[PDB]
Amino acid sequence: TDANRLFSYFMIGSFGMLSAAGAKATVQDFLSNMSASADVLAMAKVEVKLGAIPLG
Amino acid sequence: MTAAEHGLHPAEYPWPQNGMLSTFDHASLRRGYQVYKEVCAACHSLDRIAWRNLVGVTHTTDEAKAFAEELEYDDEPDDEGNPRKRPGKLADYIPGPYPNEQAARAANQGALPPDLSLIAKARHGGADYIFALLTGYPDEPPAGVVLAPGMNYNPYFPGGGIGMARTLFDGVVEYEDGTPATTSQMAKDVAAFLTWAAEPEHDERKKLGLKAIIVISAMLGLSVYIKKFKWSPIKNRKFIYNPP
Amino acid sequence: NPRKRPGKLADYIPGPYPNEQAARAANQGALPPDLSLIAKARHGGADYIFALLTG
Amino acid sequence: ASITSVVKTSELILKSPLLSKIVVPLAKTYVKFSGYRQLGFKMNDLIIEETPNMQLALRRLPPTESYDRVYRLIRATQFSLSHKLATGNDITKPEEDDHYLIPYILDVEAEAFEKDALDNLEVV
Amino acid sequence: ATTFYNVFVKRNSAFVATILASAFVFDMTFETAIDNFWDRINAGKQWKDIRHKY
Amino acid sequence: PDPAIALHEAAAEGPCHDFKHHFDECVERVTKAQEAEDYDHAEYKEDCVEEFFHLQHCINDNTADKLFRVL
Amino acid sequence: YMGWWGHMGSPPQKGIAGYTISPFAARPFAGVVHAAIFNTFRRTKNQALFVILPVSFFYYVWTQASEKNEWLYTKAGRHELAKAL
Amino acid sequence: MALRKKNSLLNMANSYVLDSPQPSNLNYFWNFGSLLALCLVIQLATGITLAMHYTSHASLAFDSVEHIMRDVNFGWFIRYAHANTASFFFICIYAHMGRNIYYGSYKTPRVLPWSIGVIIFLLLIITAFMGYVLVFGQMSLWGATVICNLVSAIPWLGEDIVHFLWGGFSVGNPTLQRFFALHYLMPFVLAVFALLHLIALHTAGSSNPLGITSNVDKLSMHPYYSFKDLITVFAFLLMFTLFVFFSPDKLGHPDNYIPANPMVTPASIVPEWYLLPFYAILRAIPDKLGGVIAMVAAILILLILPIVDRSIIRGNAFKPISKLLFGFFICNFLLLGVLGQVHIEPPFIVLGQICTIFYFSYFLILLPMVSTIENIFFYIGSL
Numbered sequence A: 001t002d003a004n005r006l007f008s009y010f011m012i013g014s015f016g017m018l019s020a021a022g023a024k025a026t027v028q029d030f031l032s033n034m035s036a037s038a039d040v041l042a043m044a045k046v047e048v049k050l051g052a053i054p055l056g
Numbered sequence B: 001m002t003a004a005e006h007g008l009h010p011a012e013y014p015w016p017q018n019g020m021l022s023t024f025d026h027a028s029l030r031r032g033y034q035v036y037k038e039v040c041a042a043c044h045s046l047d048r049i050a051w052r053n054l055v056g057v058t059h060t061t062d063e064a065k066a067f068a069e070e071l072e073y074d075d076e077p078d079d080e081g082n083p084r085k086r087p088g089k090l091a092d093y094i095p096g097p098y099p100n101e102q103a104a105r106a107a108n109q110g111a112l113p114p115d116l117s118l119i120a121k122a123r124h125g126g127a128d129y130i131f132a133l134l135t136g137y138p139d140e141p142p143a144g145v146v147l148a149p150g151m152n153y154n155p156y157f158p159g160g161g162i163g164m165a166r167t168l169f170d171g172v173v174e175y176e177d178g179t180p181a182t183t184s185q186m187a188k189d190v191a192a193f194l195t196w197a198a199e200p201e202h203d204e205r206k207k208l209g210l211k212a213i214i215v216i217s218a219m220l221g222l223s224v225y226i227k228k229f230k231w232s233p234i235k236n237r238k239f240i241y242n243p244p
Numbered sequence C: 001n002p003r004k005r006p007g008k009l010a011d012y013i014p015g016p017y018p019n020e021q022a023a024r025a026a027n028q029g030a031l032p033p034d035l036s037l038i039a040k041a042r043h044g045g046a047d048y049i050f051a052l053l054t055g
Numbered sequence D: 001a002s003i004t005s006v007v008k009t010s011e012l013i014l015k016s017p018l019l020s021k022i023v024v025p026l027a028k029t030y031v032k033f034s035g036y037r038q039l040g041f042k043m044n045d046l047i048i049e050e051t052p053n054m055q056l057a058l059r060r061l062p063p064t065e066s067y068d069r070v071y072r073l074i075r076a077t078q079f080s081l082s083h084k085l086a087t088g089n090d091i092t093k094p095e096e097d098d099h100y101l102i103p104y105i106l107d108v109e110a111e112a113f114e115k116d117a118l119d120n121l122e123v124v
Numbered sequence E: 001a002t003t004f005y006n007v008f009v010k011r012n013s014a015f016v017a018t019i020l021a022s023a024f025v026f027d028m029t030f031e032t033a034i035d036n037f038w039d040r041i042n043a044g045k046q047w048k049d050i051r052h053k054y
Numbered sequence F: 001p002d003p004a005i006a007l008h009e010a011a012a013e014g015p016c017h018d019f020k021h022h023f024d025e026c027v028e029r030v031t032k033a034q035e036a037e038d039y040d041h042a043e044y045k046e047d048c049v050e051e052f053f054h055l056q057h058c059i060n061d062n063t064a065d066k067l068f069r070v071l
Numbered sequence G: 001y002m003g004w005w006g007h008m009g010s011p012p013q014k015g016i017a018g019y020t021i022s023p024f025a026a027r028p029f030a031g032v033v034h035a036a037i038f039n040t041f042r043r044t045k046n047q048a049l050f051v052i053l054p055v056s057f058f059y060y061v062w063t064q065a066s067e068k069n070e071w072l073y074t075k076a077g078r079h080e081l082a083k084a085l
Numbered sequence H: 001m002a003l004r005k006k007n008s009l010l011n012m013a014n015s016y017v018l019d020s021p022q023p024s025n026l027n028y029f030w031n032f033g034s035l036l037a038l039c040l041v042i043q044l045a046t047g048i049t050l051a052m053h054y055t056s057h058a059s060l061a062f063d064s065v066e067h068i069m070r071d072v073n074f075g076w077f078i079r080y081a082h083a084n085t086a087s088f089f090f091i092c093i094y095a096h097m098g099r100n101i102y103y104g105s106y107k108t109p110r111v112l113p114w115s116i117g118v119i120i121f122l123l124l125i126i127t128a129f130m131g132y133v134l135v136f137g138q139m140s141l142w143g144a145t146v147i148c149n150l151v152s153a154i155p156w157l158g159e160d161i162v163h164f165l166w167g168g169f170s171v172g173n174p175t176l177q178r179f180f181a182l183h184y185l186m187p188f189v190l191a192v193f194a195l196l197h198l199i200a201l202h203t204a205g206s207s208n209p210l211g212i213t214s215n216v217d218k219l220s221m222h223p224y225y226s227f228k229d230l231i232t233v234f235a236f237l238l239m240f241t242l243f244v245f246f247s248p249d250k251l252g253h254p255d256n257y258i259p260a261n262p263m264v265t266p267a268s269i270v271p272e273w274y275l276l277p278f279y280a281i282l283r284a285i286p287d288k289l290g291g292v293i294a295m296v297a298a299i300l301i302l303l304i305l306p307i308v309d310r311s312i313i314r315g316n317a318f319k320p321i322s323k324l325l326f327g328f329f330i331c332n333f334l335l336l337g338v339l340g341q342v343h344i345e346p347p348f349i350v351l352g353q354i355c356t357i358f359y360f361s362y363f364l365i366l367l368p369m370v371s372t373i374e375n376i377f378f379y380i381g382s383l
């Protein structure tokens, strides 16, 4: 029966699905190490006051 | 070795964060920061933590910037190349009480108070050791112990004689949340805080591990079905031998 | 407290200025480069230094 | 080790009445605990064959004996991978555990050892 | 059920497309589900639970 | 007032009473030995660290969970 | 010593008929409950001594050694420690 | 002819991972080879990633590792994955060697894969030792100090060699920089040797748990062993997950989270757990040089198993006495491990000496005796 084959491909496909979801998670999390680290993200975005600054 | 030489091993306390699914109690973390700031920071540095690290853990961005802006840090030189100070920013590290080791030891009868950023990972026992140590100064040293001058008896510290005196007494801190600041409460809070300092990813790490455990368990179950499925022709094989 | 000592052979030859800003302030904005590599850091090498100082 | 060595030493033991009295019962128990018969092997099926000498002895087996050996190895491999043991007729009975290969390998080795001796002969 | 097989499984291109689309959906929903679960078992503990005081 | 003070006292009088007695006996002996003259010029000076550890280790085992429950 | 498919280096085979069924025709988990219980019990019982004997012996050794060591570094064990050094 | 067979490059992959003929009856202990391949891949991925964030200067090394833990996105994971996988690599390598000893994989015709394997084992020890130094915590420093001072026992030139390896008169920045470079390199050498021992094995093919020929009944490596290998990959990753995410410091020593201090000596310099048996062997010999030789001999003595095993039968499946002897050998190897982490005190000093003698006497006395006797029992017992 088609039912019979379909079941085993549902198992194979579930396994492929979790492997794909797991690989995406693994790659995305692992490669994010290469994005700017927390110290860099804070070395940027510099904040400055304006109250100190006189006209001219 | 004698148990004295090893130090008494600390009890296993049920910390909120013990447990595969448990985060830190962030209200305790905040209380613990207040203990660090009002008691420990007199002698101990927390050099690996920046003001930005408290944000969204213990403090809002505004509270943390306020803490940073109260301090002065070394700026780049002015136009005549003279040194300058600036107010602190979120990316600054929490500054130490002493400029160098020599200053630290001179203030502490020769002993050097370690940096506390990693102390929870750098001692067997972790939070339990910190909690046990801070709460474990007996009123009287066991009869027959000879303490060196400037040493205090504490059984959890290896050798028994520690250069750090008892520091937590009921009501040395006034918590902002109305929690009674008992010796034990303050030690629990500060020990939680220091554990967070040593492992700030702890909450995120355990959530991702929950996801990993679930997916990897499912994939393990499925991999066993698939293995059995593909191997069934070999396992089920039958032979008939007719000698020629 | 900080302290000074007399120099030893392993010490590096000390500069006239503590930082770039001090250097530029003393030289009408220009920064005199470090001369340790200047002969390799310019096309020409010794010839460039000789030509410049005499030119 | 050489099969020759094993066979010679065994013969020394079987000769000595004292020795045989104590060793033969032990060896029978050992073989029962060894449990190769429970996979339908004969003892000789277990001898290491990836040696030039043993390859030659296997080529000298009579066709019948050789075909039966291949069946026992394939059967045992199947029981191994199934984690089942032989049952019924598949279990090797003590009377069926014949040394079918020992004569062949002893002849192969006899020649190989003679060859080594004779390579070292000195005319007097 | 034959229909299901014929559409999603028979062609490998369709099967792999189905697997990847499923992976996308699983990934998104599982993230959301774990987030909610984690917040319930760690209730009153996390920064989001105490932030309102400030 | 510190919850630990009362829990430790309760555990000493109760489940760790045998260990409390040992430590007490030890301190009595050592103090008495220190009282006697030419103690400073003795080979072996006895402490009570061992007995102290046995007591503390016991108290901690009976108290740990109770203490953290009231914080 | 090993060839390849077609000439693997088997003695010539003859007279063995091999039969199997498709993975799709089989129950992959047929008799799994029986095997998980009875087969694993059989296989574990057969190998138990080879694990239990060495583990129990070396655990006993360790236990005696660690208990002696502990006792030597007590007050009671002062004298025996002095002799042992 | 199929492309996978026709094309020379594809054919090499084919011959190793797809059409490779395997015995049909390999059990789960044959899966450690692929787990060791997985460990080696995880160590390369995590290792190369850490190298992108690590600074090899001694003034900055420890701080760079804290930067990884605290600032780099997922840095905690990459660091703990790398550190824990080094432990798992040794669990899998001891398992793989144990499997090879129990099933007689070292016998003809597989002496060459075995012998290259013993070298892989040495490279792994060196690799993991150098990596441990890179943190430049207290265990890093005091580990490099004591281990490199063993070389001082080499007569005449020993001191000179130590100073040459350190690049100075003590462990310091030069040592750290050179261990970084070598720790990066050594895993690639280890991968090449891993590949060589497989090429060597290809001539005979895998042994099997019965110790008989498998030439009669072969199975393609794929799909059967491919899918079998996934079960242990996921089992491994479950174990990995429990350590990496839930207990990342269980296998380690807290002393390495204290920055290196040449003045302060730690309470106890004990190596990483997987080195402990060799450390116990070294302590057992009172002589400094004796100890070092014994420690190296404890690894190199594996090279004589092909000689000292006199059995006419390959492996222990059918040898009850050999199985008992092997059980005692393995448990003794674990006891040596435990004795490597106790203090040098009675009664562990004498016990360590007894266990060390037992370790060597297995190869030199017992295995030759037991294997000879079992030969005779098989022959007499089956008459």
Ligand code: HEC
Binding pocket: B035, B036, B039, B040, B042, B043, B044, B108, B111, B112, B113, B114, B116, B119, B123, B130, B133, B134, B157, B161, B162, B163, B164, B165, B167, B190
């Ligand atoms: C005025 C001094 C002082 C105060 C206040 C102080 N410490 Fe210390 N601390 C020390 C000194 C000195 C040492 C080192 C003692 C030694 O090595 O003998 C030390 C050591 C420690 C150690 C490590 C002990 C070890 O195992 O090496 C920890 C943890 C610690 N302190 C935490 C704290 C915490 C938490 C507080 C307060 C909430 C605190 N300290 C308050 C001076 C202080």
Ligand code: HEM
Binding pocket: H040, H043, H044, H046, H047, H048, H050, H051, H054, H065, H079, H082, H083, H086, H089, H124, H127, H128, H129, H130, H131, H132, H133, H134, H135, H183, H184, H187, H188, H190
């Ligand atoms: C067999 C492969 C490897 C093994 C067994 C191994 C082992 C180790 C070990 C034990 C440490 C100490 C870990 C710690 O406690 O923090 C470490 C650190 C390190 N390894 Fe590896 N390593 C391997 C491969 C590599 C490779 C290929 C690189 C590539 C550069 C690398 C880079 C590093 C770096 C940068 C560190 C220091 C950062 C740190 O301690 O995390 N490793 N390694």
Ligand code: HEM
Binding pocket: H029, H030, H031, H032, H033, H034, H036, H037, H040, H093, H096, H097, H100, H105, H106, H110, H113, H114, H116, H117, H118, H120, H121, H190, H194, H197, H198, H201, H205, H206, H207, H208
């Ligand atoms: C990086 C480390 C190693 C890797 C990746 C590795 C990988 C493998 C693989 C994949 C196989 C074939 C599959 C298997 O039998 O498990 C194998 C077989 C083998 N390995 Fe290893 N191995 C490594 C280290 C070692 C060591 C240290 C030794 C010996 C001390 C060793 C000796 C062998 C032997 C003798 C075989 C043949 C065993 C047989 O099939 O009967 N290997 N190895």
Ligand SMILES: CCCCCC[C@H]1C(=O)O[C@H](C)[C@H](NC(=O)c2cccc(NC=O)c2O)C(=O)O[C@@H](C)[C@@H]1OC(=O)CC(C)C
Binding pocket: H012, H013, H016, H017, H022, H026, H030, H031, H033, H034, H035, H036, H037, H040, H190, H191, H192, H194, H195, H196, H198, H206, H221, H225, H226, H228, H229
């Ligand atoms: C892609 C072709 C390049 C050839 C080398 C690549 C790898 C390769 O051959 O993979 C195979 C999948 C191999 N497994 C086996 O031999 C194997 C054989 C029999 C049974 C089982 N298990 C039981 O159930 C097996 O696991 C394996 O894991 O060995 C790696 C180590 C190899 O890596 C290298 O040497 C290169 C480098 C990365 C170390």
Ligand SMILES: CCCCCCCCCCCCO[C@@H]1O[C@H](CO)[C@@H](O[C@H]2O[C@H](CO)[C@@H](O)[C@H](O)[C@H]2O)[C@H](O)[C@H]1O
Binding pocket: A027, A028, A029, A030, A031, A032, B204, B208
């Ligand atoms: C062969 C590879 C091919 C090229 C593929 C390129 C992939 C590189 C993509 C890096 C993407 C990272 O992007 C970022 O991912 C992290 C997780 O890593 C997510 O972060 C989210 O989950 C993580 C844990 O997983 C938490 O720490 C975080 O609080 C949360 O926001 C971000 O929501 C997303 O902004």
